[PDB]
Amino acid sequence: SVRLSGYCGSPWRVIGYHVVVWMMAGIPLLLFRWKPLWGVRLRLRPCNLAHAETLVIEIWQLFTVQVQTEVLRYYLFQGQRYIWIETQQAFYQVSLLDHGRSCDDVHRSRHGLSLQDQMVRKAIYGPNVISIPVKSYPQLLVDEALNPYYGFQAFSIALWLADHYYWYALCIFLISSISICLSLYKTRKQSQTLRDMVKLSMRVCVCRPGGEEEWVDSSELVPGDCLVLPQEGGLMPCDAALVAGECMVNESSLTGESIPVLKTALPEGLGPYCAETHRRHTLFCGTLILQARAYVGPHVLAVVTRTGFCTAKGGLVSSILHPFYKHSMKFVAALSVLALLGTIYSIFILYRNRVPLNEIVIRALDLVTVVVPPALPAAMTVCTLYAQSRLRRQGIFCIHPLRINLGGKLQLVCFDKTGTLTEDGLDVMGVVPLKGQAFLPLVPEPRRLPVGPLLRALATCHALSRLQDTPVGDPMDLKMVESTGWVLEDSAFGTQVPVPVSVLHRFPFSSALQRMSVVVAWPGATQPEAYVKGSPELVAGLCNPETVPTDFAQMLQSYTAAGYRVVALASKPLPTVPSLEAAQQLTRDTVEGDLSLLGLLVMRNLLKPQTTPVIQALRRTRIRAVMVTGDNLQTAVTVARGCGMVAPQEHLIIVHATHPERGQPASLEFLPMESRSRHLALSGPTFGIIVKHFPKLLPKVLVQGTVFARMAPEQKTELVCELQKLQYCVGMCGDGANDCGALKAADVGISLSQAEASVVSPFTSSMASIECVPMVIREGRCSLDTSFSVFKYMALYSLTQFISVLILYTINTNLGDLQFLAIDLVITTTVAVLMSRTGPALVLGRVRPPGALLSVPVLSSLLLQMVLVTGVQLGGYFLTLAQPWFVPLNRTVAAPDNLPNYENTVVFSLSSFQYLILAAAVSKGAPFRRPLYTNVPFLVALALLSSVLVGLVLVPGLLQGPLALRNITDTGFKLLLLGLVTLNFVGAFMLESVLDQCLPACLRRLRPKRASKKRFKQLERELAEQPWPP
């Protein structure tokens, strides 16, 4: 359901809105960006939809759209046009304008569209272009830079500039500015790349009423134009229906398969033309026409049905354009409420301490920046930068490094079959000869055959030509001739190293007979030899019944039930004289009759050598591998059993759904096919029928579905989205244009292609194997572990500084600008960068990292470490006050005037060690990272900073002038402080170990969680309890 709200404008009201939102305050702009309803109710008056100039489109999601008048009122919502029909008084979508018009209606368009008609239809539908918007850098910045965090960072920078904290403000400002500039550049470059990808400019020939023909740009195409298709082929500029002639189309952009698809003219009937019902008569935008035949009439005719975004390619592009962090944000909000409480206490004590008002405000507001660290996201990003560098070294290119963290959450990866799991093209599996009347064993090496009829039939029965000293022609012909070892030189062929045979004539391959004929001869022969090659069931009807085996159909189906490309070959001795004076005057029908079937050639798309190891490694780590292919279900099932997606002990069930016809509803048919433990296999049609008519059975299908074949690109996207609705973290790995929606919609989409799929995918790999998936999963698990560690350190760091500054505020002192700077810059930056440094573990494990920062382990660790930190700091403070040499701090003045003093000195000396202790304690090794002792730079940095601090404590006058520290002459007290920090070190490491070891066991044995939050785990539970298909 949708709702259209109409708003006009008043100039006085427009100026009034602008002044009230600009001169009064800047906050109203952000308030209106957070809810645009108030902004549109203030700036625009409500107007009747017939006069509206602004519409609020709400689907809950709210959108605002400007209404454009040519007259023709219309608007664009997500690339789709909604023209205003005055007679019906509504904004009707242009996709529905000629919906349900008959096949005779399409056929009457074969004479073309006039110029007046084309102009009105271009006014209505627009140009035949997929127009992708590339925003300007200000327009692009308003989206990102208005992040709430960036506002908090701006507030903190302004505060630090008001507080003479210039250097850390400059560091934070530089980091944020470079990050924003990089994000803007990346987004604009990706937009420009996608725009260049979807752009299609070409000259097309359209029929015009009166018999004429006009060459126009493909953008001038409107629904109702009659395209004149080139006989030589080419890219299809729009969606069309064939009304005259036939075509051979490469539909890999829709299916991923380069096999030629035959398109025939639409049938003339009084029934509504449908792109799915008449898919075999429809030419889709972006697909490649290989050749077009005009049997009746001069030229091949197609009637334009959909242009622009209304094409299937346009729908895919629109889906691409218009589709841990939660707990991080909630923890930051909790840090903010703690900031409010600490600010109240700070105001109270500073007013007690007789601090001036402006200084009270500065201190209380600086406490907020203290407890909420402005440098948290950069610290979280450093680990993803390390992971991205490692991945680029391994050949995997990531455009957004923060997407790497999602690799640690993946429980399911979807795979395209062709080019991703299997090779791009077919390979010669063998040739099946015939001895006598029965089949022979399959011969994997056709050149190992003797020099007989079948070898020369494989070698010379084709239509290849030599070009650039390289054979060019039919691809399967090229591969079989490469297999035979014979080299091309009508034509002649030399054996692999026999007698070189020369072709005497050749009859072309026609799509009607779907078979080819040649006539060959050689010196030392008795008579010429004619070869025939084509569809095996069609060649079998021409040979003698005493040559075709009785097991022919069964063997052919056994071959083709696995997705093999069988092609038969036959031959004939001809009583013709061995001369071209009679051999070129043969009619082909006499050659096709009385054949002798020589055998079959079996071609298959082989599984890549890296596929089965990776799939078995994924299944061993309990990650679901799902085949989502555009190919047929038999090939998909065979490849899924081949790559180990379906183990031989496991059961596969085909789910077949039937459309609800007149009088009976849709039904689900389950047919178990002989060889988790239960896998489901279904087609695109079945997937759609289940999505529409069985929405309660759909989750079980998605939880048990392993093979999804014959899927359209939007169906791949829908599968990815429906699996994400089950709370899966979904990965997609594909290499085709039909995979772009699923690669953009997936959490981790890896592109095996460098063209037209690299644009929309977060990750691109230079290797054509799926070995990138375990690499990305390992790097993502390492990055998620490292990000947990860095977040825990920054939280502990924020709290430690909070406790320090509170203890010091209570006595009317502070830490010190240079002590603040040491802690903020030197310690914290060194620690964050060298924590993020370590790489991933070498082995994938079955257990994956936690994806929740609000977990009980994380919160318990933080709380206990902070208890120990607060205890050590308060104990050192109260031990300092108990000393005989201790003197109070002259509370009459405030910091930094009362510095140096013993209290700040001891508090800083303790907390500065605590930062390194917590840094070392939150860091982890196994199972998702390399061992912590291998991080030699980090350990050396910890030791060096510890030695610097031990010098600050022990060596008199060491940096005490700069850091405004007080000299303590009691060496026993300094040794007591060092023993206290050693206590904190040992206690922090023991706390981390005790938690990481015994907290899971206690959480399990104490309160058992029988039900997971994940929807798919609950579905797996209830399927284990009650298996759905009985």
Ligand SMILES: CC(C)CCC[C@@H](C)[C@H]1CC[C@H]2[C@@H]3CC=C4C[C@@H](OC(=O)CCC(=O)O)CC[C@]4(C)[C@H]3CC[C@]12C
């Ligand atoms: C406030 C200021 C002073 C902070 C400055 C911090 C920078 C010096 C940090 C932030 C990100 C760090 C980078 C994070 C990622 C990497 C990748 C790393 O290279 C690899 O990981 C290759 C490994 C492989 O391919 O096997 C080299 C260090 C480097 C550039 C780090 C260099 C130091 C950087 C630039």
Ligand SMILES: CC(C)CCC[C@@H](C)[C@H]1CC[C@H]2[C@@H]3CC=C4C[C@@H](OC(=O)CCC(=O)O)CC[C@]4(C)[C@H]3CC[C@]12C
């Ligand atoms: C007057 C005082 C308060 C100013 C201190 C100067 C800082 C700008 C210096 C002191 C310590 C320096 C840090 C020393 C250690 C590191 C780790 C280093 O990491 C790497 O080189 C990556 C190599 C790898 O991982 O392979 C990046 C620079 C950085 C953060 C340096 C950034 C600049 C720092 C913060």
Ligand SMILES: CC(C)CCC[C@@H](C)[C@H]1CC[C@H]2[C@@H]3CC=C4C[C@@H](OC(=O)CCC(=O)O)CC[C@]4(C)[C@H]3CC[C@]12C
């Ligand atoms: C006055 C100066 C010289 C003080 C020196 C302090 C050092 C003795 C501290 C600083 C950092 C500490 C290191 C911090 C962390 C590690 C990793 C830790 O390894 C493990 O926890 C096992 C599993 C894993 O590596 O993940 C072993 C101790 C060690 C080297 C610590 C050993 C003692 C170190 C070197």
Ligand code: ALF
């Ligand atoms: F390459 Al595919 F489905 F196998 F698009």
Ligand SMILES: [Mg+2]
């Ligand atoms: Mg593919």
